[PDB]
């Protein structure tokens, strides 16, 4: 055990569990011979790139699962949400860290994976004849996130049973509590909009339900801490 720091942010975390570098690539920058070599894109290092610790969600027996969108989650938050908004283009890598705090008397298993272009699909009326498009509160939940309503198909008509095909990591209470994931910038373009397009979405679902005997804390706090890697911006407004 030891604590790492990035500016004014200091998190207490375990030595170095197995990290998952999504798709074997490290969030790097973008060279000079690109599309916009004129408007030299300024890369934040100071405060912009540090440890943000989102409002902890409480695991319950009945919990269905949660998901956040990127970069949406932060475009609201602090000095990073500052850049994302008053800037024309954005490319950024991510270090995501998820941890639970539970006694050796709780049981559960959370799959934690990242899914590019996570496009939500609602119920469509029920009988299948209403072309209802997911709201804005469902498409970009912010930093509070949003709860799945049909985990089995990941609110989008896809088996979750196959989500492992994405950069994932498991959190089995009886073995580990913290899971870490490095995500590179993934998109069909070098740069893009930070407010219109959500390159990906963080998914965390209880595959084995939370359980405990009466008397033990009934809710397990899940704490998501995340940090931007090699983040770049272009065209101030």
């Amino acid at each position: 055990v030891a604590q790492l720091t990035i500016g004014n942010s200091t998190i207490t975390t375990q030595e170095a569990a197995n990290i998952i570098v999504g798709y074997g690539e490290w969030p790097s920058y973008c060279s000079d011979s690109d599309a916009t070599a004129v408007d030299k894109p300024t890369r934040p290092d100071v405060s912009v790139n540090r440890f943000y610790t989102l409002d902890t969600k409480l695991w319950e027996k009945s919990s269905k699962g949660w998901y956040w969108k990127f970069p949406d989650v932060l475009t609201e938050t602090g000095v990073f949400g500052q850049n994302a908004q008053f800037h024309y283009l954005y490319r950024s890598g991510f270090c995501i860290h998820v941890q639970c705090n539970a006694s050796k008397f709780h049981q559960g298993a959370l799959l934690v994976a990242v899914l590019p272009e996570y496009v939500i699909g609602t119920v469509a009326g029920g009988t299948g004849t209403e072309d209802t498009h997911p709201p804005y509160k469902q498409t970009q939940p912010g930093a509070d996130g949003f709860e799945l309503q049909h985990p089995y198909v990941l609110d989008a008509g896809i088996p979750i049973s196959q989500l492992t095909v994405c950069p994932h990591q498991w959190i089995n209470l009886r073995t580990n509590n913290c899971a870490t994931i490095i995500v590179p910038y993934i998109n069909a373009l070098p740069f893009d909009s930070a407010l219109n397009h959500c390159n990906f979405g963080l998914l965390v679902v209880p595959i084995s339900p939370l359980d405990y005997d009466q008397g033990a804390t009934p809710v397990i706090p899940i704490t998501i801490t995340l940090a931007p890697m090699c983040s770049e911006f272009a065209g101030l407004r």
């Binding site: 609602t122 498009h133 979750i160």
Partner: protein, 218 residues
């Protein structure tokens, strides 16, 4: 010992049927002896789910045209197939000047002449066609709309100033070639409802596969 068949190109080869134009004489259907077909690769049912296995893709398409009368007959009639690239204006009528715009590749062939066949490049202004887009273009109805995935339109019509003497049926096949794919994703396990979004039936949510009685009986 060989695994050539499990490659992407192997998986996506084969020219499938993705389009069918009807040009009846008397009819409600395409009354002006012409038709416009915006290129949809979902035209081959089986397709959608196969491609939706990946997030991004790239490829070239080889189009082959099969034309005959409804009974599959061959007749002395000449035809014009016009490809209007995306951004180019499709013909609103059987005499639209678009039919003569050089910048719209066109190919002529007699029904007797064997199938027409041409290759179409990776259009998209983006680095890859992307089946999923988690955003909107600068609750909405523009969600999941990556327009830069348009391949173009195919306008078909009988040559000549006057309607054709025969009822015609064109079939469009498409072989995908030189394929590259990225970011694989969960195989659609629910039925498709719309050509645009991934929406499903929230009542009829079925288990991926066949169920059984007990977990101790086979």
């Amino acid at each position: 010992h060989s695994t050539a068949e499990t490659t992407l190109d192997s998986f996506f080869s084969r020219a499938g049927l993705v389009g069918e134009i009807d040009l009846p004489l008397k009819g409600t259907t395409n009354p002006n002896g012409y038709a416009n077909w915006d290129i949809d690769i979902t035209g081959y049912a089986q397709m959608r789910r196969k491609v939706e296995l990946f997030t991004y893709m790239r490829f070239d398409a080889e189009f082959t045209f099969v034309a005959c009368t409804p009974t599959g007959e061959v007749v002395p009639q000449l035809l014009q197939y016009m490809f209007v690239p995306p951004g180019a204006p499709k013909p609103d009528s059987r005499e639209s000047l678009a039919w003569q715009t050089a910048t719209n590749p066109s190919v002529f062939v007699k029904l007797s002449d064997p199938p027409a066949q041409v290759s179409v490049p990776f259009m998209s202004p983006a680095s890859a066609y992307q089946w999923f887009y988690d955003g909107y273009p600068t609750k909405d109805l523009e969600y999941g709309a990556m327009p830069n995935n348009m391949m173009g339109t195919f306008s078909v019509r009988t040559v000549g100033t006057s309607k054709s003497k025969y009822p015609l049926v064109v079939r469009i096949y498409m072989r995908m070639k030189h394929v590259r794919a990225w970011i694989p994703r969960p195989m659609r396990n629910q039925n498709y409802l719309f050509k645009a979004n991934p929406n499903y039936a929230g009542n009829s949510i079925k288990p991926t596969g066949a169920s059984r009685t007990a977990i101790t009986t086979l």
